[PDB]
Amino acid sequence: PQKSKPGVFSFLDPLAYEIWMCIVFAYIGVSVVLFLVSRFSPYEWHSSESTNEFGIFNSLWFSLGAFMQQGCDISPRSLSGRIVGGVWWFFTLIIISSYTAKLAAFLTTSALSLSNVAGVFYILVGGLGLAMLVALIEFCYKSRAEAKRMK
């Protein structure tokens, strides 16, 4: 019957949902293994500060930056951390290239309309609002702690 317009989350169409789930799982596993191989050894520490800054939060940030082809301010320096980074880089290259090719196949001339990216705009604005809320919550908690210490 009537033509179905593109979905709001239509940017996920080129890859199957199982691929997305396994991508999330691989991201989590890569971040955990990177943090483990970077921080577990007592001989990489020095009250005591680590030689590298690859904690779990920083490992997750590094993996997310690598997957998005952006990069961050830190890079692994040990052999095992560099092995993790290299395999993650190869995985990212293959997956992103496949996604771009399949997106080119799927978008089928006519210019792309805002209805095709309204979902990514919604996600962006929601993320900005969440970040603002988190920052305000942290500020309120710190101010309350300061007031409690004062009184």
Partner: protein
């Protein structure tokens, strides 16, 4: 200067509020072909569509946000988007946030010992800009379902977003400067 910064923030807040309230109020958002009774060049806004030529010039009609069709192929997403567009909840939310930010600026002027009010005004202005962005995206998406043009009412709202972001930046700067002064005196 602190006085110049305060004056600029107040003037920008008033300008953004006036531009947004004009954009929501007037009906020159879109210049598209159509009808104004029950295929000519008409002008439409968030609520009304009016013809600008012919024997029906100057006649306005309320927008049919839910046209009387079969409606047995539409899903819930289309109804949700159409309801959001018809309510125009995000432009009005942006207007309300801008008004509350201006009220916060005035109250802080009356409550100069209280510094969280400046931060609240900055947050209100940033949120108003974000709400404006969401409303613009919703309006453009709802118009998707062949030459059309946007009028000055649409661009008045677009200018309100940029000003609100700029006024929001200035308000956060004053909050930073005010707390730096307190540390200097400690």
């Amino acid at each position: 200067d602190r006085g110049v910064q305060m004056l600029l923030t107040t003037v920008g807040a008033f300008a953004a509020f006036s531009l947004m309230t004009i954009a929501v109020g007037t009906d020159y958002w879109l210049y598209s072909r159509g009808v104004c009774k029950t295929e000519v060049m008409t002008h439409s806004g968030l609520w009304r569509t009016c013809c600008l030529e012919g024997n029906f010039k100057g006649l306005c009609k309320q927008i049919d946000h839910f046209p009387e069709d079969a409606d047995y192929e539409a899903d819930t997403a289309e109804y949700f988007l159409r309801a959001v567009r018809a309510s125009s909840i995000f432009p009005i939310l942006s207007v309300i946030l801008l008004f509350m930010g201006g009220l916060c600026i005035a109250a802080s002027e009356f409550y100069k010992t209280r510094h969280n009010i400046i931060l609240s005004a900055g947050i209100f202005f940033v949120s108003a800009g974000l709400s404006n962005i969401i409303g613009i995206i919703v309006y453009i998406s709802a118009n998707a379902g062949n030459s059309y043009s946007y009028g000055w009412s649409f661009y008045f709202g677009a200018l309100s977003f940029i000003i609100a972001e700029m006024v929001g930046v200035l308000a956060v700067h004053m909050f930073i400067d005010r707390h730096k002064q307190l540390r200097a005196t400690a």
